[model samples]
Target chain A: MSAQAIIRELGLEPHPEGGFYHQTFRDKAGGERGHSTAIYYLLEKGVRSHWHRVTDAVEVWHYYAGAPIALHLSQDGREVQTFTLGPAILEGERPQVIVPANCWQSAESLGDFTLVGCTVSPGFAFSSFVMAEPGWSPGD
Target chain B: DMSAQAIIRELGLEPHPEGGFYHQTFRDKAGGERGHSTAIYYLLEKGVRSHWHRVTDAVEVWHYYAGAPIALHLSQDGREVQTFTLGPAILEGERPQVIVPANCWQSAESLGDFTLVGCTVSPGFAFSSFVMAEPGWSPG
Candidate 1:
């Protein structure tokens, strides 16, 4: 299916991070942030999930549809590492990738589009989310 | 070059009642009725199968991570089975994620050396909610 079709079918909306997203699942048990939450996220070519970090929650990304994605992650906000999120195992593409709590992350599609799912433990709240400054860079 | 033994130890997986191994990776902490959702890391090695079982009231989503392809079997009403393969060969008809609707009978087996995957269930999961098919039960 095309990215547009997926977005409409999943009821996804423009995300602040340069992608389309829809929160698909959430747990009710929690003190404030709930228990866990899952969302459908999609990125189109040339667009990127700019730098951001979710504090105190680990996020797992699952490849669902569309093209492969290049995910960049960093612990200290520098010396980033890249991982391929796709279905071609022989090409070192992984169907799932985990981002530890407080780790900086960014992503972009390698093809025309990439659709993926993200599950966050401890749920997700804007209070715990942070978008990097516009001038921030992974490294020189 | 990772072995099933190493993954079991690393993930701290325990023997599952139906078959293979699993580890509860996330549990909701809500004080309400169902606690929202839960997740687990499930693995099946060659010669092992995840026996037929059903979660009476919750929908489950499976995400493949590593190892060989997994053949998943499902029957919503105990007949008319459908099978899906979860692997990295998307272009070859493999899917990275598959959803099992509530009350569906499900079983799985690894088609290679081993299969590593994760399962997320909505409305949480409880022992009381799980039902295993009769010994030697078959959809046919």
Candidate 2:
């Protein structure tokens, strides 16, 4: 086994985006068409962000550690709503949030925190994105 | 002090096909967007395993609740590969798997009868061959 394989054997992946990090454990059947679930870790001021629309699957997020993060939602460049999470809702570090398909959403780190997320789809691919328009920023 | 059992009940996680469970959590972050992230749990059957693939834009986390030994396979070009082994360590009903970024390729399997839970972030849908073994390869 290779060193990277050794790391996989340890069930750990080195963070590529500096301080903050995320990892995914995918399980499916009959080809790679199935479901994927992931976990993310964020430190103070460690920002790793992305926004896109899924044409085939629906997604969700769960707060598993620290303070809650800011969630931004919108459509067609128009603001739809926002959500704040904290220790209370997560039942003291196990709260989860869900995001549906066809909506534009982004997350902002609130203090230092960690979140667990999951997605359910027929197949996994890269061509299923509908990127949001430019200059569509959320949070401070 | 809500146990995983209790939390599962409060959140109403229902069992699904292939020993999988599903739960939904919704939260609205202040100064953020109103979106929901779904959480799904998979209980691995005896000696079940999966192929490896990279994640694109989706963040993931896995928490091993009960099992013998769980293995993770990671690859970059899909040709070069690595593997990691976790557990046989008592979860004590806590601790979780953390994954970030959508760029790395990954997959997992159970060494014995075990429970592997996973989560994902927004835009949880895709359509790509990245899920399949890299060119000229098949899962062992």
Candidate 3:
């Protein structure tokens, strides 16, 4: 159940946002953002997903295995919200969470590692992805 | 914290033509020949099953969400079937995501009290592309 083992088995690669990921599904129809895309994302201890958002699409995260994650999200004029994504549904964890379009989001492992799947639609385009400015904080 | 019925009710799932409960959670507006992508929350209670069916041109990715594990059966050519488990027990060889290749025959059922899953289909999913197996057709 190690992160390295799963990464190797899944052929994961480094992500620009500070984790590991592998694109599992992608829509072939070409257009602005296409239709939808899905990826297997993994975060390890001390690693965090930097604040970022898909300006034109919604992202749904599905917890797969490993430890839980502390996911944080915020939208324009809204305070940040935090949640857990894991198997402990009775202990305030959720198996899935949807990050609305244009909502800034980030996450970190609460334990050794966390594996999840993220589905983005209207597909996902790097052109519409926005990363936060340097030194951005959730409280900001 | 919630039961199978509660999850269905809370999600407003309706009876699916394939023999379970489901709610379409996402649909891209790409407006292509068959759109871009679509996702759904699907649930099967104990003793319920998703009848054998196939998508002619679209690929479907299934993500396990909650409750019991599920047994997913797939046949690339209506024979040579393979069964996969979708659950949180990754260490025990259970997978959290399974991809059904386009034009392949597939079916699923809950292994316990209930099973909830999310399915994402690319180039979207239309009745025109769906085909159910013939009556009495069995993988065996």
Candidate that would win on lDDT: 1
List, residue by residue over A1-140, the lDDT tens digit for candidate 2.
23233334445433332224445555556457546635444434355344555566665656555555555455444543344434442121224444556667665555543343435454434566665555556332
User: Candidate 3: where are CA atoms >4 Å away?
Assistant: A1-140, B31-33
Could you report the DockQ of all the candidates, in the order they appear?
A: 0.02, 0.02, 0.02
lDDT of 3 by residue, A60-92 (tens): 999999988777778762466555677764343
Summarize candidate 1's per-residue lDDT along B1-140 as a digit string, tens digits.
99999999999999999899999998888735567899999999989889999999899999999999887877888976655667776644467788888999999888888999999988798889999999899886
lDDT of 3 at B107: 87
Candidate 3 residue B60 C-alpha distance from true site, Å: 0.3
For candidate 2, what is the DockQ? Answer: 0.02
Q: Each model: TM-score of chain B?
A: 0.96, 0.54, 0.95
User: Which segments of model 1 are wrong by more than 4 Å?
Assistant: A1-140, B31-33
Model 3 chain B: weakest 10-residue lDDT segment is B85-94
Summing lDDT over every window of 10 consecutive residues in candidate 1 chain A, give the lowest-scoring window. A88-97
Q: State fnat for each of the candidate structures.
A: 0.00, 0.00, 0.00
lDDT of 1 by residue, A13-120 (tens): 999888999998888788666789999999998877999999889999899888888777787876664566788654346778788899999988878888999999
**Where does model 1 sit among the CAPRI classes?**
incorrect
Give RMSD (Å) of candidate 2 vs. truth. 18.3
